Amino acid sequence: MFNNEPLEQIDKELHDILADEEKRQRETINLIASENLTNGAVRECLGNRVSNKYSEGYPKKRYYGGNDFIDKIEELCQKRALEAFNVSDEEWGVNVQPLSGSAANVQALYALVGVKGKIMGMHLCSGGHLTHGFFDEKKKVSITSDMFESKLYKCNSQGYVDLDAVREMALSFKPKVIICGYTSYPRDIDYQQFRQICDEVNAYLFADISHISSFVACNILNNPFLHADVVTTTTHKILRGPRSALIFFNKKRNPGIEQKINSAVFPSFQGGPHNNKIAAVACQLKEVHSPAFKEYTQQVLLNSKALAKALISKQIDLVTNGTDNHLIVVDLRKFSITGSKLQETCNAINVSLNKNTIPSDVDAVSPSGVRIGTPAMTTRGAKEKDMEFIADVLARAIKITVDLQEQYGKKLVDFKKGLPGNAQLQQLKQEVVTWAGALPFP
Amino acid sequence: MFNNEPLEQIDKELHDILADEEKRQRETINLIASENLTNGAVRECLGNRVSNKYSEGYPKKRYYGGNDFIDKIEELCQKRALEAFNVSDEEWGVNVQPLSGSAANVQALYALVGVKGKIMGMHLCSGGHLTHGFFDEKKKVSITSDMFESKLYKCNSQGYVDLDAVREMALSFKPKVIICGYTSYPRDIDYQQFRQICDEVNAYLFADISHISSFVACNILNNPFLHADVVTTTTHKILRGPRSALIFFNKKRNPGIEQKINSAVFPSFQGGPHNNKIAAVACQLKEVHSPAFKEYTQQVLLNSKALAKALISKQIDLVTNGTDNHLIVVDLRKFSITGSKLQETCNAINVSLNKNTIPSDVDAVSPSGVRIGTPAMTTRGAKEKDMEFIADVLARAIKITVDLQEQYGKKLVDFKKGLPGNAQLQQLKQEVVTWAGALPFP
Numbered sequence: 093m094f095n096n097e098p099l100e101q102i103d104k105e106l107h108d109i110l111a112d113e114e115k116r117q118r119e120t121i122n123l124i125a126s127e128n129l130t131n132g133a134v135r136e137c138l139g140n141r142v143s144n145k146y147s148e149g150y151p152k153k154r155y156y157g158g159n160d161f162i163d164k165i166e167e168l169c170q171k172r173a174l175e176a177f178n179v180s181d182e183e184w185g186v187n188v189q190p191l192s193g194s195a196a197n198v199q200a201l202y203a204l205v206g207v208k209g210k211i212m213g214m215h216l217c218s219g220g221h222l223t224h225g226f227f228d229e230k231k232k233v234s235i236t237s238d239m240f241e242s243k244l245y246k247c248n249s250q251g252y253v254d255l256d257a258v259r260e261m262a263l264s265f266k267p268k269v270i271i272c273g274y275t276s277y278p279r280d281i282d283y284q285q286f287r288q289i290c291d292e293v294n295a296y297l298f299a300d301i302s303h304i305s306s307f308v309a310c311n312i313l314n315n316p317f318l319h320a321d322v323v324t325t326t327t328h329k330i331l332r333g334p335r336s337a338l339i340f341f342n343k344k345r346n347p348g349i350e351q352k353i354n355s356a357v358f359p360s361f362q363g364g365p366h367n368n369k370i371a372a373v374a375c376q377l378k379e380v381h382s383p384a385f386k387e388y389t390q391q392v393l394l395n396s397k398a399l400a401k402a403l404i405s406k407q408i409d410l411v412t413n414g415t416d417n418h419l420i421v422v423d424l425r426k427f428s429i430t431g432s433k434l435q436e437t438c439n440a441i442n443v444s445l446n447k448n449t450i451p452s453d454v455d456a457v458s459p460s461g462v463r464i465g466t467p468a469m470t471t472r473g474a475k476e477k478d479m480e481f482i483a484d485v486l487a488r489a490i491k492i493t494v495d496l497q498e499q500y501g502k503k504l505v506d507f508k509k510g511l512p513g514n515a516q517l518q519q520l521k522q523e524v525v526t527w528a529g530a531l532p533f534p
Numbered sequence: 535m536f537n538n539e540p541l542e543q544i545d546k547e548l549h550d551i552l553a554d555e556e557k558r559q560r561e562t563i564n565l566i567a568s569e570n571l572t573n574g575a576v577r578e579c580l581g582n583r584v585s586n587k588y589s590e591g592y593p594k595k596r597y598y599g600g601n602d603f604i605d606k607i608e609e610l611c612q613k614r615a616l617e618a619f620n621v622s623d624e625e626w627g628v629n630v631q632p633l634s635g636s637a638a639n640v641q642a643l644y645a646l647v648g649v650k651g652k653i654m655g656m657h658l659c660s661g662g663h664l665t666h667g668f669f670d671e672k673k674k675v676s677i678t679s680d681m682f683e684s685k686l687y688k689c690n691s692q693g694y695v696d697l698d699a700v701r702e703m704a705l706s707f708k709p710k711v712i713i714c715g716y717t718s719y720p721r722d723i724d725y726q727q728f729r730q731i732c733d734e735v736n737a738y739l740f741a742d743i744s745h746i747s748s749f750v751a752c753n754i755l756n757n758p759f760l761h762a763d764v765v766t767t768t769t770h771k772i773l774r775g776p777r778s779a780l781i782f783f784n785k786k787r788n789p790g791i792e793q794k795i796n797s798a799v800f801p802s803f804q805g806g807p808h809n810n811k812i813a814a815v816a817c818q819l820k821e822v823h824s825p826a827f828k829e830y831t832q833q834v835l836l837n838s839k840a841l842a843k844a845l846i847s848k849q850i851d852l853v854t855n856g857t858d859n860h861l862i863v864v865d866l867r868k869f870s871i872t873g874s875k876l877q878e879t880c881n882a883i884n885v886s887l888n889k890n891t892i893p894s895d896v897d898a899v900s901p902s903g904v905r906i907g908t909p910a911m912t913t914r915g916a917k918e919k920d921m922e923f924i925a926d927v928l929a930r931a932i933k934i935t936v937d938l939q940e941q942y943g944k945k946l947v948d949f950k951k952g953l954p955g956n957a958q959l960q961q962l963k964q965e966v967v968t969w970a971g972a973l974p975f976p
């Protein structure tokens with residue numbers, strides 16, 4: 093007693109928008125550092141009938157039966173995850189049920205410390221995530237600042253984690269957890285030194301590697317598995333999976349942690365798992381471990397270096413003056429424009445990027461930079477050579493943005509009035525569309 | 535720089551299990567009250583490239599641009615929700631970002647009361663959900679019992695909500711929120727009398743209609759929108775949508791609650807929305823408002839009534855002696871068999887159901903009932919006349935279960951040993967498989 097007419101017929105309104113969305117993605121130069129493009133196989137899993145099944149609990153300890161094939165999937169996923177991140181299943185466990193990065197981080201945080209627990213994280217403005225204890229004078233913005241008691245450490249004026257500052261805070265504040273691994277941090281982390289500080293205060297070491305996950309897995313960057321008690325990652329960014337999260341726990345360093353984490357995810361926070369997610373993640377973790385994906389991941393770094401170097405060749409300042417990974421943060425202060433202004437300008441030319449704070453910023457209201465990343469364009473087949481054009485396009489966007497701020501004023505209201513119809517943008521959008529439109533698209 | 539081979543070729547290991555899962559579902563008499571079968575249109579959305587997009591925030595108040603098509607989808611979803619539940623967008627607001635029902639309930643609860651806040655709900659044993667403040671003396675099982683201060687009311691010995699007890703507890707406990715709407719409650723709710731109790735103590739009225747949402751929308755059951763400040767629902771049960779949740783808030787009864795709820799979902803708890811979910815919910819919500827879906831929903835109730843009547847005709851006791859909705863709880867005490875045993879016996883004959891507590895149950899570990907629902911089999915084309923056969927199959931399972939407990943004993947390790955090979959089960963599975971396998975299957 094159901095309707096099996098295809099999407100186009102059943103909901104023409106929705107279907108059109110979706111095709112328009114597809115067309116925008118195909119014709120956009122996507123620099124969002126957190127974004128990527130999923131292959132068909134990952135999308136076949138996400139629309140699989142497996143999502144019909146309620147399987148609260150864990151494999152072999154399910155609340156309901158008929159979960160034989162679901163158990164096989166969730167176990168095949170856990171295996172592939174530990175394999176991908178080069179950890180022994182005797183030493184490390186993994187939970188594959190968290191629905192997304194923010195859920196996963198809160199769940200893990202809860203497991204280790206619980207309500208009222210003391211946590212430490214990098215401040216949003218310096219490059220941390222909201223889920224790392226972010227708050228404001230005015231409001232506890234994240235549940236992580238409110239269900240826990242959080243303290244926030246800043247990077248120095250050059251954009252770098254200052255470990256001396258971390259230690260000063262950890263010895264006076266005395267938290268049960270310190271988080272490292274970040275949302276807009278263009279450099280590698282000294283996990284060993286975090287681990288050293290954690291031991292000094294008897295604090296847990298938590299590493300959120302969502303942005304750099306592929307780098308850790310392919311052994312291109314520092315390995316926090318060597319030192320961390322917990323490692324979290326999303327699966328949708330550089331990893332190129334669906335929208336989900338993984339929580340890794342160090343069984344060997346702390347026994348009784350497996351139950352704590354597993355019970356945090358369920359039943360403390362979530363109910364039924366999303367089996368289409370789990371299948372989809374499994375399908376990408378196969379690909380993560382293949383040597384072709386190591387190729388891709390290397391290409392992401394190659395591209396990120398070339399882009400920084402090309403941006404520096406056009407006299408554009410970068411936070412930390414370069415990158416060790418997939419992401420760059422442009423300091424726009426010398427041009428007397430805001431990140432918000434350039435974001436607007438870049439959307440008018442089909443360039444997705446996001447405004448980002450820099451160390452000199454005192455408020456998140458007017459961030460002075462933008463953040464770009466290479467994983468999505470690397471997925472679409474761009475090489476080091478193709479990075480000069482992108483750097484060139486961003487330099488032209490910066491110029492046009494200065495031109496429009498001169499003509500229409502610095503008020504954001506007024507600036508946007510300038511943007512529609514501008515001949516330079518239309519031309520620049522057209523070039524962006526022509527080059528972007530022809531790149532391979534999964 | 536990506537692999538575009540289909541799922542079968544890329545990952546044959548995974549694809550076989552999914553085909554096996556597909557086969558099991560097609561060949562199962564699925565009585566899980568919370569399960570359903572989604573159509574091809576809903577699954578085409580879930581596999582859509584819209585999930586590629588990071589769109590943190592709300593429509594027109596997005597952190598990043600390039601969200602013009604994403605904004606149209608999230609707005610078309612919100613609209614269709616309010617239309618589907620027959621509320622005016624002037625009086626009611628809806629949040630479409632919660633990833634699942636348990637996320638939605640915590641998010642809404644935190645909005646209304648915050649950390650340390652007082653809440654009331656129905657006990658899990660009595661038919662409530664985990665997210666309604668469920669705990670044990672041993673442990674704060676749900677975050678809703680730990681991040682909030684929770685008190686739990688009990689249903690009476692006949693399985694009904696006892697409003698006198700709710701009042702007695704409400705005036706003494708003085709909560710800020712009282713929750714009704716339940717996971718395994720076979721009767722309609724008195725929302726008016728809940729409102730009156732809530733008004734008496736200056737508490738919010740929270741209605742969780744995840745199990746009954748179709749009935750509320752289609753006007754077959756009591757409307758909680760007339761009396762509730764907050765209404766939560768999942769989209770994947772009787773609603774027949776993807777795995778997601780909705781939060782409805784009554785703007786007129788409490789202005790400035792829209793911001794409380796929206797801020798709760800993001801950035802308090804979640805990060806980026808899952809736009810494939812959002813698109814999938816939109817697609818189902820169009821179907822919800824059609825009159826053909828009203829026809830289906832009526833049928834779920836016709837079937838549920840007929841099933842109860844047939845079960846009573848075979849001298850089987852139901853909690854509350856019947857049903858007003860899509861679900862039944864079978865009291866098995868007169869047969870001296872547990873729900874766990876009958877779940878095991880039913881998995882062996884490809885009958886999906888779950889064990890469930892009854893009012894005489896003191897502990898959750900040995901529940902004395904099973905819970906069944908009609909939504910899924912109604913989706914597969916079963917009519918009133920097909921319910922006698924389902925009741926006949928469950929009766930035979932009950933007798934087989936008594937026979938096996940006779941031969942191998944009451945201990946569960948021993949009981950299951952009897953299960954494989956039994957002539958009657960193989961016979962019963964065969965008929966289950968024959969009838970199940972030929973029914974329509976989206």
Ligand SMILES: Cc1[nH]nc2c1[C@](c1cc(-c3ccc(S(=O)(=O)Cc4ccccc4)cc3)cc(C(F)(F)F)c1)(C(C)C)C(C#N)=C(N)O2
Binds near residue numbers: 218220222228447597
């Ligand atoms: C969206 C998101 N998620 N996780 C994140 C972010 C970033 C971010 C986050 C915010 C942000 C700031 C505050 C709040 S708030 O307290 O809820 C309300 C408020 C917003 C604006 C002004 C005044 C009050 C919510 C989000 C602002 C910006 C910025 F670019 F606008 F500055 C960037 C970027 C990756 C986009 C960010 C940075 N940088 C970091 N590190 O992590």
Ligand SMILES: Cc1[nH]nc2c1[C@](c1cc(-c3ccc(S(=O)(=O)Cc4ccccc4)cc3)cc(C(F)(F)F)c1)(C(C)C)C(C#N)=C(N)O2
Binds near residue numbers: 155662890899900
């Ligand atoms: C799974 C789930 N989710 N939401 C729910 C349930 C039900 C339920 C839930 C439980 C349940 C009980 C305790 C816990 S616990 O304390 O977190 C962990 C624990 C593990 C092993 C041994 C003891 C405790 C978690 C779930 C038990 C049963 C039962 F049938 F076994 F009794 C049923 C059914 C729909 C399945 C339930 C009922 N009835 C209600 N109303 O809602």
Ligand SMILES: Cc1ncc(COP(=O)(O)O)c(CNCC(=O)O)c1O
Binds near residue numbers: 192
């Ligand atoms: C360190 C970190 N953790 C978690 C998340 C996200 O979790 P959700 O899947 O719940 O969004 C992000 C992405 N932050 C936004 C970005 O980089 O664009 C992140 O950077």
Ligand SMILES: Cc1ncc(COP(=O)(O)O)c(CNCC(=O)O)c1O
Binds near residue numbers: 745
């Ligand atoms: C009233 C209620 N609320 C919330 C949820 C679940 O949210 P999730 O999507 O996070 O599981 C359920 C499902 N309860 C299990 C069942 O009925 O089978 C429920 O019955």
Ligand SMILES: [Cl-]
Binds near residue numbers: 366369808810
């Ligand atoms: Cl999904």
